[PDB]
Structures are given as C-alpha cells and as structure tokens.
C-alpha cells in the first residue's frame, strides 16, 4: 500500500533533494518563516493559549506541501471524524475509541449500541462531582467521625501513569491537605509503605478495576481492606459499614464491588471504548479530581475539548496536531530517526515524558496494518526525556554533538506560578537558547576566533577546534502555553493524543489495541510453577533453561 | 581511520552474511550456547556474583571472534591500563581519569604530578569515615544540642544523579531515621519544600562545589544558611559556631569554605580527574555514606574494585564489560540501532536507567575523535528504561511488535530482601519470560492454533492472526546478581563505566570531556538581559527572535 502511494514517493524524492539543506538556509530565504511555520490555538479562557513553533526543521514549502498531501491522500481527517462519531475504528477488538466523549463539553450526542454515551459520561462525572465535593469539603467521614486527609490509588500502567503525571503537573491547583499516593507494584512493598504512612481513620482507597476481580490489584486492595479491619478490631471500633467509608471503586461490576463492602453509589464506571493510555479523562481520573476538585477537572476536560474542536474543524496546513504528527513523520520515516525527545522546561511536568512513552509507544509500536500484513515503513519512535534544566547537565551533550538526529519537543510556559523572583527568566533564557543552539551551531571559524581571544597556544588550537565545534542543523519544536493551568494541560495531552492518531492513520496501523503484551504473560504463567528449589527445566531454549536452572539451584 | 581497519570491514561482511540469521538458529546448532556466551564474576563475598548472559543475540562464533579482534586491533586493553596508571587520557582537558583510584582498595600507587593520589583518596575517605560515624552515632549535634535526623544534598547533574540512584538502590542498608533530600533546581522551589519539611536543629546541609563560589548551588545553599540564621535569631539561640554544626562542604577551596562558616576539617575534597558522571565513589558520595554508613560504602567501593580487577586482567573473550561493549557495538554500528534499553526488575534500581543516560550519553555522545576530525561511525546510543513490572504495561508493546530493533539489558536478582512472600517468584517468572518472548516469537501457525482452540469464527481468524504474531529474533542481555547489596551495586556501575570506556576507545572519541553543553550556556547568557517587558530583539534568527518577542510582550 503505502510504499506505492504517489504522496510517499514524492516525499522520498524531496528528502533526497533537500534533506541536506541546513535548517538555517530556510530562514535566510524568507524573513517571515517563524510566522508561516507556527500555529497558535486560543484556549478561550484567561489569555491562555497553546502555540507550536515548528520552524526549526529541515522542511521547506515544497516539503510542507507534500506532507499535507500525504495526510489528505490517507484520509486522516475522515478517519478522525468516524472515531469522533463512535465508529468501531479499534478494528481488532471491534470497538469504539471515545476518549473524546469523556470531555465532550458541548454534549454532541455520540451513539454506540443504540445509546448516547454522553448520558453515561455526564452521569459518572456528576457522580464524581458530588463525591469529591463531599470528600474535599470535609463532610465525608471515615469510620471514627474524622474528615479525609489521604487518598491512595491502587492499580498499574494506564491506571497509574495518567493520574500520577497530572496530579504532579497541577500541584499548584491542588488541596495541599490531602496527600496522594500511587501504588503500582505487584509485591506489597509500596502498599506497606503507605499503610505505615497514613492514618486509616482519615483515608480513602481507590480501587481501579472494571471486572473488580483482577488478581494483582484486588490483592493490594485487600492489603488495605485487611489493615482497615485489623485496626478497628484492636481499638474496639465496630466494622459495621466501615469499608463503605474508606473504599471506592472505578468499575462496572456492580455486585462484586458491593460484595467487597463498597457502596455502589460510589462505583465510578468507565467503558471499553476508554483505552488505558487514554483514561485519565474518565473515572480513572478520580484521584486527580479529588486533588484539584471538580471545577479544575472540568477545566482540564475543557482544554482537551478545545483541542478536539481545533483538530476536527481546522484544515490540515493550519492544524496543530496534524503538523506536529507530520514533522514527526518527516524525521521518523525519511530521516530514519528512531527517537523522539520530549523536554518540558517546567518541573511540574516532570512525569510528562514517561506518560508520553506509554501513549505513543503502546499505541504506535506496531508491526502490522488493519487490512493485515506487515507495515512497509517505520512506525512509532522511542520516546524519552526529562524536565528542563535537569537533562541539560546530562544527555544534552549527545543531542548537540552526537551522531543521532533526534527530534526534540521543547515545552514551556510564558508565566510562572511564583510572580516574584528571577528563577523563571533564567530558565526561559535556556529554553530559547537550546533550540537556537541546536539550529545554528558554532563554526570552525567562530571557535578559532574565541580560542584566539582566550590566547590559546598557537598550536593546541587547530587540534582543539573540532572538539568545540557544533554542526547545528538539528531540529526542535518549541511549544508554549501562556500558563500551565488544568486547561492548558488538557490541551497538551489531547494534542499528543491526536498526533498519535494521525501518525498511525498514515501508517495504516491500529493505534488502540495492545496485543504486544500477551506473549510475555503466557510464557510467564508457564514458568512460575517451574520456579522451585532444586527443579531443573528442559522445555525451553537453552538460555531460558540455563537462567531458570541457575535461579532454581541458587534461590533461598 | 576506523572505516579502513581490516577488523571493521570484516564485521560489515559478517553483518551482511549472517545478520538475517534468527537468534534461535544459533541455539539449534549448539546445545551449550548459554554457557559459551555468558560470563560469571565472583564478587568474592557472601556467595554474591555478577553474571552476564549475552546468548540471546544475532552473534555466532565467527562474529564473536571478529568482535574480539576489533578490540585487540584498537588496543582497548592498553588504553585502559594507561588510564589506570594515571595517564592523561582526557586529551582535550589534559587530565587523568581516575575514578578507579577512588575505589583502589589494594592501594596500588597511582602517580599524577609526582604524587601518589591514594594518599589523598584514603585521607578524604578516612575523613568521611570519622564524620559520618559521628553523625550516624548521634554524637554530632546541631546548634541546640540535638542529634541529626536529616541530610540535604545541594547541587545538580552528576552531583545529584549518582547520590540519588545509589541511596534509592540501597534503602534496605540505610539508617531509616535520617531522611535524604536532593535539591537540583535553579528556582528555589525544591529548596523551600525541604526547609518547611525539616527541623533545622537536627539537620546538616551538604554543599557540592569545587571552587565553592559556583553561583546556582551557592544560592540554594545561602537559602539554607539564611533560614538557619533567621531561625536561631527569632528563638533567642546564639549564631556562634552555628553554621559549622549544620553545614559541610564537598570542595577544594579551603578559605572560601571557611569564609562560609564551615569547619575545614569538614571540607571533603575531590579532584579534577574525578568526572561528574564518575563521582559517586568520591566525596560527592557523602550522602550515600551517611545513609548506609562507612562499612557499606567500602563494600560499594569494593564491588567496583573487584570489577576493575576483573576488567584489567581478564582476556577480552571472557571479559564481561568488554563483551557487553562489543555486543552493544554490534547493534549500534552494524544493525544501526539508535537506542539501548536498560530494564531492572527490582524497584530499588528505579533510578538506574536515568543514571546510565548521564554516564553513557554524556560520555559517548561525541562527533569527533581525539586525533580530531569527524568520526566515521555512529557513536553513543540513546539510553532509556524504567524498572521492571512498570514498563511492561507500557512501552514493552513496542520492544515486542514495533519496527525498531532495540538492545535490552534485563537486570535482576536471584534473592529478594523479603524472604517470605510470593511476589519475587512471580517477578522473576516475568524476567525470564520477557527475554524468552523477545527471542522465540509466536508464529502465524501457533496463533492460528490458539485461535482455533478459542473457537474463533473461521473467518475473523485469518485477518486477526497478524495482529497477534510476534517475529521474535529480538536481542536481550540477562544480567543477574545473587543479591543487590552495596557491593553488587558497585560492580554493576563499574561494569557500565567500563562498557562505556570500551565503546569510546573503539570509536576513537574522548569519553571524559563534555564540550557539548557550552553553546547553550553562552547563548543563554546573551539572551537573559534581552528578557524584559516590551523589549524587541532582532539579533538572532527569526524563530529565536519571534519566540523571545512573544515572551517579552506577554510575560507579567
Ligand atoms: O478492569 P480489570 O478487569 O480489573 O483489568 C483492567 C485494569 O488493569 C490495568 O491494565 C492494570 O491495573 C488497568 O489499566 C485497567 O483498569
Ligand atoms: O566545582 P564548581 O566550581 O562549584 O562547579 C562544579 C560542580 O557543578 C556541577 O556541574 C553542578 O552542580 C557539579 O557536577 C560539580 O561538582
């Protein structure tokens, strides 16, 4: 398919033709480049905006035009409309992909199975509203008459990463009183930690499971339920109704949540068309909404919804996530770059790169197309990154002087939470300079000039130059926001969510399944029973057998 | 140079010839493969060992032999001996590279500038011994007569990452009483956090600076010094000698540390031949030695020293870090793989991948050779990873079904800190299965078989198969340790340190300089003054100007 599309053949030819042209050459030609290769979205509240500047790239107009034609030829916009209308675009699982519904502020009806799913979203949202308002107000009391000061979220993967990244990002909008803890480990270690950290009389446990029997998570949950029960009993406090005051559920399995001791009025549902890596917007986000409250969660949802609207209605050339996706395709698929750095210059976004690893690589780390049959081109790249400043006395050495071309998203804010201090100006001088540095480089001649002005030996100058030269012509996107509020954050996540949709559409893959984990799960089930003192296995390959056999002969 | 070496030409030819041969084919041929492609190091204490199993790779004997011949031809072993003997192998800075001295337990004399540096190492070690013993015993008192229960380390980069990774890794060997905090940010945010978290009467601040005037760090340090002074004054406690009881220095600038109020008997020195990313072994490691105490730090140093000895004396074919480096070169330089995953199945090692990003990419992310002139081949790869279990409901999808070949180091322990519970067996069943999964894959035919046994529709089977197939033939190293003690940890870091030495030697680069950060620093200095309300700049390129101008017109 894709290897024989005119539009891709056209891009090959332009990569061959203009690929070696320095980034700086495209600025020397036209003096409005910054303007023509940047997009600003009005976030429609409080002077906030989301702005992408993709100017610092190996892309001219002929290329930019070829990239937009690829997206038309692949029918990206139409595939998106169908997703947005509840079509079962998750082909291999036969389901809708409706994270857009979870933040559909306008209540545009969306029909799955002869029902408007917005009924259900708005019902669970309004259920969360009433619940969180009652916890955050003080009115909800644990078994002894005390208000709640801790929330411990139980689960793993997309049931942990989202809530973690988002409550971190938004600490300045959060009730500082109630501490949030996130337990993801199979061993009870992190759970035991938090139980010897919290007063159980002032705490709620969130259990995140759709069937509400899932073995790992329901284990860590019983750790809590058992500690709660042991604690009441020793101190002469009755257990009657007690789990109902210290436990809530993110689930559909009404009677099994009720058997567990939870009041089903406190079972916050979500649906099969909410994928794990697209779930913070749903009831999975309950810990976020506890932490920052309802109005702020609605702002978060709204900033996403503003991004959905921008993405659905805006023609490709001016369409922010589309252009984001398309510069990523230029690098991933024609330059052959294997990686994507995400570098937020705001310490609150410190967990954003990890989140974007889940979202991007779990979605687009695929080898086959929907129609089935191997992909003919590179799919998703390896996402990495750390929060700005930090990475700078680390792996920036390599982005700058190494032999790998790596696309970098620099993300930053115009304003700072702390109005007074010089901290922020200094930080943003680095944010602009790094992308400037990557593009322009520093010449043999410029270095020579400097080293002469330092009065270097006439001799140890010619052999020193090359260590201090930078090539430049290394790409970077600069992404800015006026301020990192809930709503800006929601727009940033949604932007990446649709960047991912767009890349996977163009490649022909299903972005919304995850069959890649199955193999490891099945081979582990078959190994567990073989782990016993003195046992030798022979039924695997030699390495697996050796390793297993070393474990069996040396453990306890 | 390197492009015209017989040994490299030989490897190209073998990549072309055997590159497509499945990993599993090398097991079918010989039944002892596991044994012949694995190395065990005796760590000489407590049944502990460090073991590398590199069998699951696209390497046969002809290749393995070509790779060892590359290392001989490049004179890796001789370059290492010179480094170990205090030769100035850091060419561009004209200095020794002597992190091996810092853990030279045997006291093999090493001469830099007509002096045995071991005099100085052992003196600072014995200074740290006496100091930490006195803090950890209770005997050191803050200004009010109280023992110390907090340690706050101040600095960034290699002055933060090492201490952080290592105290995390070794929490089970640590005084649980004294909390450790690590401040790396330029904005005072994280510093203010820790000052409203600690009682100043029971705390020591570690300041990590060689000149002891370095502006950022000395700022955050004065935040602490100023808070200390303000606190005594309000509560009617004298300031006489008070900074001397609450502050210590990691530095050489004796009189400037003394001007700051610190007792120079408490100035813990280190040397210019200790690079930042190789510094935890030195006095930079003071917070580690506080946390776990002297005997444990010596065990840490010793495990490294055991690794140095193994690395210096063991012929290449049986030499663990050499073979590690060489399989990494096979993938990085012939397969063209841009990345390196490090995946520790032990939650205590959760910060190891970040550390290894600094170490690897800051060392080997270079574009020029020592003799000067551009490198003809790919140098360091992009390191990423997270701790086992976690990553598994994330980006494992991509390692398994994506279109990028990525070398994975799986690192694990035979034993667990908590003797009773099933947690650990379950974890290691995943550790073995993942590398098994990556190698063997799951066939069109095997999947068909399963889906038939599930009674799938006869029809939605042929189009479903390919989504559930795995290709296999994806490499993995399995690295095991009997137990993650201080000494095993030290052996693991040193192993990677020498893997890095070996790769950079083969490529011709200086692994021990870091000129790649300079450009950004200089362009930031020049931008800072341009950041002012209403100011327009025109002296940069358009993107930089635009971005700056947007900031200036929209900030406060
Ligand atoms: O919904 P179940 O049956 O409990 O399992 C699904 C859950 O497991 C996870 O994959 C891991 O906790 C979550 O993302 C998800 O909510
Ligand atoms: O030793 P100075 O002059 O204070 O600056 C060096 C220090 O700065 C850092 O790069 C950052 O804190 C450390 O690695 C190092 O110890």
What CATH number is attached to the domain comprising B486? 3.40.50.10490
Structure tokens at B462: 């042929």
CA distance A97 to A512: 7
CA distance A452 to A537: 69
The full 3-state SS of A111-161, as one line of letters, equals EECCEEHHHHHHHHHHHHHHHHHHHHHCCCECCCCCECCEEEEECCHHHCH
Burial category of B537 from C-beta neighbours within 10 Å (exposed 0-12, middle 13-18, buried 19 and up): buried
User: Which of A270, A228, A235, A231 shows the shortest CA–CA distance to A249?
Assistant: A270
Reported resolution, Å: 2.3
Assign B21 to helix, strand or coil.
coil
C-alpha distance from residue A347 to each of A285, A289, B241, B400 (Å): 21, 21, 36, 32
CA distance B163 to B158: 8
Domain shared by A398 and A465, yes or no: yes
As a residue count, chain B comes to 556
Tracing tokens 């210019």 back to the chain, one arrives at B272
CA distance B464 to B157: 48
Domain shared by A208 and A251, yes or no: yes
User: Which of A417, A413, A443, A418 shows the shortest CA–CA distance to A431?
Assistant: A413
CA distance A56 to A22: 10
Burial category of A42 from C-beta neighbours within 10 Å (exposed 0-12, middle 13-18, buried 19 and up): exposed
| 8 Å CB contact between B260 and B211 | no
Burial category of A369 from C-beta neighbours within 10 Å (exposed 0-12, middle 13-18, buried 19 and up): buried
| 8 Å CB contact between A389 and A412 | no
The phi and psi torsions of A208 (rounded to 5 degrees) equal -105, 90
∠ Cα A524 A529 A535 (to 5°): 115
Burial category of A144 from C-beta neighbours within 10 Å (exposed 0-12, middle 13-18, buried 19 and up): middle
Number of other residues whose CB lies within 10 A of the CB of residue B20: 10
Domain shared by B399 and B519, yes or no: no
What does the DSSP 8-state code read for residue A53? Answer: E
Pairing of strands B203-208, B247-250: parallel
User: Which of B112, B120, B502, B155 shows the shortest CA–CA distance to B282?
Assistant: B120
Pick the catalytic residue from B168, B201, B299, B362. Answer: B362
**Could you tell me the sign of the dihedral formed by the alpha carbons of A501, A503, A505, A511, in that order?**
negative
User: Which of A552, A535, A531 shows the shortest CA–CA distance to B426?
Assistant: A531
| 8 Å CB contact between B71 and B510 | no
* Residue-by-residue DSSP string for A170-181: TGGGS-SSSEEE
Q: Where are the alpha helices (DSSP H) in B152-240?
A: 161-169, 189-195, 215-234
Domain shared by A276 and A395, yes or no: yes
CA distance B375 to A117: 58
**Residues of A508-531 as b/e, b for ≥16 C-beta within 10 angstroms?**
bbbbbbbbbbbbbeebbeebeebb
Domain shared by A259 and A160, yes or no: yes
User: Which of B224, B529, B556 shows the shortest CA–CA distance to A417?
Assistant: B556
Q: What is the dihedral of CA B398, B402, B407, B408, to 10 degrees?
A: 20
- Catalytic (active site) residue A99: no
Pairing of strands B382-384, B339-344: parallel
Pick the catalytic residue from A299, A362, A386, A497. Answer: A362
CA distance A477 to A327: 9
Say how far residue A537 (Cα) sits from the centre of its chain.
40
User: Which of B413, B346, B339 shows the shortest CA–CA distance to B380?
Assistant: B339
* CA closest to B552 among chain A residues: A414
Say how far residue A174 (Cα) sits from the centre of its chain.
20
Q: Which residues in chain A are closer than 8 Å to B466, comparing Cβ atoms?
A: 368, 372-374
Assign B98 to helix, strand or coil.
coil
CA distance B53 to B37: 6
| 8 Å CB contact between B38 and B55 | yes
CA distance B343 to B392: 10
What does the DSSP 8-state code read for residue B196? Answer: T
Residues 6+ apart with CB under 8 A from A475: A23, A56, A57, A58, A327, A331, A405, A407, A408, A438, A439
Give, rounded to a whole angstrom, the gap between the first and last alpha carbons of chain B: 55
Q: Which residues in chain A are closer than 8 Å to B415, comparing Cβ atoms?
A: 555-556
- Sort residue A373 into left (φ over 0), alpha (ψ -120 to 50) or beta: left
| 8 Å CB contact between A382 and B398 | yes
Domain shared by B235 and B292, yes or no: no
Q: Which residues in chain B are closer than 8 Å to A537, comparing Cβ atoms?
A: none
Q: What is the extent of the structural domain holding B384?
A: 1-137+272-508
CA distance A55 to B547: 11
The phi and psi torsions of B115 (rounded to 5 degrees) equal -140, 145
Tracing tokens 């086992």 back to the chain, one arrives at B388
Tracing tokens 């009806």 back to the chain, one arrives at A109
CA distance A54 to A37: 6
CA distance B200 to A162: 36
Domain shared by B48 and B154, yes or no: no
CA distance B265 to B243: 14
Q: Which of A189, A375, A403 sits opposite B347 (nearest CB)?
A: A189
Burial category of B496 from C-beta neighbours within 10 Å (exposed 0-12, middle 13-18, buried 19 and up): buried
* CA closest to B388 among chain A residues: A185
List the single best residue of B395, B408, B478 to mutate versus A (max A Cβ within 10 A).
B395
| 8 Å CB contact between B289 and B130 | no
Residues 6+ apart with CB under 8 A from A350: A168, A344, A386, A387
| 8 Å CB contact between A177 and A185 | no
Structure tokens at B263: 């007792």
The answer to whether the Cβ–Cβ distance between A365 and B544 falls below 8 Å is: no
Q: Which of A367, A393, A406 sits opposite B401 (nearest CB)?
A: A367
A156 in ligand 1 pocket by Cβ < 6 Å? yes
What does the DSSP 8-state code read for residue B334? Answer: I
Pairing of strands B49-53, B38-42: antiparallel
Assign A99 to helix, strand or coil.
helix
CA distance B480 to B477: 10
What does the DSSP 8-state code read for residue A331? Answer: I
Tracing tokens 């803890």 back to the chain, one arrives at A181
* CA closest to B186 among chain A residues: A423
Burial category of A29 from C-beta neighbours within 10 Å (exposed 0-12, middle 13-18, buried 19 and up): exposed
Helix (H) or strand (E) segment spanning residue A183: strand A179-183
**Residues of B156-171 as b/e, b for ≥16 C-beta within 10 angstroms?**
bbbbbbbbbbbbbbbe
Tracing tokens 């436990």 back to the chain, one arrives at A247
Domain shared by A342 and A263, yes or no: no
Domains identified in chain B, total number: 3
Residues 6+ apart with CB under 8 A from B139: B147
Tracing tokens 């954050």 back to the chain, one arrives at A489
Distance from CA of A119 to the nearest CA of B (A): 31
Residues 6+ apart with CB under 8 A from B520: A392, A396, A400, A430, A433, A434, A437
User: Which of A195, A171, A289, A176 shows the shortest CA–CA distance to A246?
Assistant: A195
HSE value, Cβ hemisphere, 13 Å, CA-based, for B261: 20
Q: After which residues is chain B broken (C to N over 2.5 A)?
A: none
Starting at the edge strand that comes first in sequence, how are the strands of the sheet with A339-344 ordered? A38-42, A49-53, A476-481, A408-413, A339-344, A382-384
User: Which of A297, A10, A523 shows the shortest CA–CA distance to B434?
Assistant: A523
Domain shared by A355 and A489, yes or no: yes
CA distance A528 to A310: 50
Domain's final residue, options A271, A300, A329: A271
Residues 6+ apart with CB under 8 A from A217: A154, A155, A156, A159, A207, A208, A209
The phi and psi torsions of B153 (rounded to 5 degrees) equal -90, 130
The phi and psi torsions of A474 (rounded to 5 degrees) equal -110, 130
Q: Where are the alpha helices (DSSP H) in B235-340?
A: 242-246, 254-259, 286-292, 294-313, 320-329
User: Rg of the Cα trace of chain A?
Assistant: 26
CA distance B207 to B243: 12
| 8 Å CB contact between A275 and A464 | no
CA distance B424 to B422: 6
User: Which of A309, A305, A484, A485 shows the shortest CA–CA distance to A411?
Assistant: A484
List the single best residue of A433, A456, A476, A540 to mutate versus B (max B Cβ within 10 A).
A433
Number of other residues whose CB lies within 10 A of the CB of residue A336: 12
What is the CATH classification number for the domain harbouring B543? Answer: 1.10.1390.10
Helix (H) or strand (E) segment spanning residue B480: strand B476-481
Helix (H) or strand (E) segment spanning residue A339: strand A339-344
A153 in ligand 1 pocket by Cβ < 6 Å? no
Domain shared by B193 and B295, yes or no: no
| 8 Å CB contact between A287 and A297 | no
Domain's final residue, options B250, B271, B292: B271
Q: Which of B364, B425, B440 sits opposite A528 (nearest CB)?
A: B425
The phi and psi torsions of B410 (rounded to 5 degrees) equal -95, 130
Structure tokens at A37: 């290769």
What does the DSSP 8-state code read for residue A391? Answer: G
Structure tokens at A190: 């992190």
Tracing tokens 């005594």 back to the chain, one arrives at B232
CA distance B133 to A258: 55
Q: Could you give the angle at which helices A61-74 and A6-18 cross, rounded to 10 degrees? A: 160
Domain shared by A293 and A354, yes or no: yes
Number of other residues whose CB lies within 10 A of the CB of residue A126: 11
Ligand 1 centroid to B285 CA: how many Å?
Answer: 41
User: Rg of the Cα trace of chain B?
Assistant: 26
User: Which of A345, A313, A317 shows the shortest CA–CA distance to A415?
Assistant: A345
Residues 6+ apart with CB under 8 A from A261: A225, A242, A243, A244, A247
| 8 Å CB contact between B178 and B207 | no
HSE value, Cβ hemisphere, 13 Å, CA-based, for A524: 18
Structure tokens at A324: 């984001």
Domain shared by B452 and B532, yes or no: no
């Amino acid at each position: 398919s894709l290897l024989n599309l005119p539009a891709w053949k056209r891009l090959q030819s332009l990569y061959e033709k203009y690929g070696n042209d320095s980034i700086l050459s495209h600025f020397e030609k036209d003096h409005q480049r910054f303007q023509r290769y940047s997009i600003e979205i009005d976030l429609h509240s409080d002077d906030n905006f989301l702005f992408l500047d993709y100017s610092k790239s190996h892309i001219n107009d002929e290329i930019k035009d070829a990239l937009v034609a690829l997206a038309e030829e692949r029918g990206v916009r139409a595939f998106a409309k169908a997703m947005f209308d509840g079509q079962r675009v998750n082909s291999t699982e036969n389901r809708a992909v409706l994270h857009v519904a979870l933040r559909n502020r306008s209540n545009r009806p969306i029909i799955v199975d002869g029902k408007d799913v917005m009924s259900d979203v708005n019902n669970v949202l309004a259920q969360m509203k009433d619940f969180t308002e009652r916890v955050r107000s003080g009115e909800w009391k644990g078994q002894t008459g005390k208000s709640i000061y801790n929330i411990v979220n139980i689960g793993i993967g997309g049931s942990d990463l989202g809530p973690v990244m988002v409550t971190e990002a938004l600490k300045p909008f959060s009730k500082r009183d109630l501490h949030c803890f996130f337990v993801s480990n199979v061993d009870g270690t992190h759970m035991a930690e938090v139980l010897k950290q919290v007063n159980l009389e002032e705490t709620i446990f969130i259990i995140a499971s759709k069937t509400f029997t899932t073995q790992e998570t329901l284990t860590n949950a019983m750790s809590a339920r058992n500690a709660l029960m042991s604690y009441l009993k020793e101190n002469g406090i009755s257990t009657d109704g007690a789990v109902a005051k210290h436990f809530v559920a993110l689930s559909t399995n009404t009677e099994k949540v009720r058997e567990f001791g939870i009041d089903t009025v406190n079972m916050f549902a979500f649906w099969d068309w909410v994928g794990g890596r697209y779930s913070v917007w749903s009831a999975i986000g309950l810990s976020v909404m506890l932490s920052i409250g309802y109005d702020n969660f609605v702002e978060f949802l709204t900033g996403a919804h503003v991004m959905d609207n921008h993405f659905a209605s805006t023609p490709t050339e001016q369409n922010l996530p589309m252009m984001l996706a398309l510069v990523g395709i230029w690098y991933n698929n024609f330059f052959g770059s294997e990686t994507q750095a995400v570098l937020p210059y705001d310490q609150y976004l410190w967990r954003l790169p990890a989140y974007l690893q889940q979202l991007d690589m779990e979605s687009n780390g695929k080898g086959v197309t929907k129609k089935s049959g191997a992909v003919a081109v590179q799919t998703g790249p390896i996402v990495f990154g750390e929060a700005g400043t930090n990475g700078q006395h680390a792996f920036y050495q390599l982005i700058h002087q190494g032999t790998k071309i790596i696309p970098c998203d620099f993300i930053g804010c115009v304003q700072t939470q702390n109005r007074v201090g010089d901290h922020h100006r200094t930080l943003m001088s680095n944010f602009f300079a790094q992308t400037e540095a990557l593009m322009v480089g520093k010449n043999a001649e410029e270095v020579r000039q400097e080293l002469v002005k330092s009065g270097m030996s006439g001799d140890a100058i010619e052999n020193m130059i090359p260590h201090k030269t930078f090539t430049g012509s290394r790409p970077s996107n600069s992404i800015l926001v006026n301020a990192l509020t809930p709503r800006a954050l929601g727009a940033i996540i949604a932007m990446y969510e649709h960047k991912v949709l767009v890349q996977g559409a163009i490649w022909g893959i299903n972005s919304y399944d995850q069959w890649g984990v199955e193999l490891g799960k099945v081979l582990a089930k078959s190994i567990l029973p073989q782990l016993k003192s003195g046992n030798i296995v022979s039924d695997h390959d030699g390495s697996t057998n050796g390793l297993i056999n070393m474990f069996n002969t040396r453990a306890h």
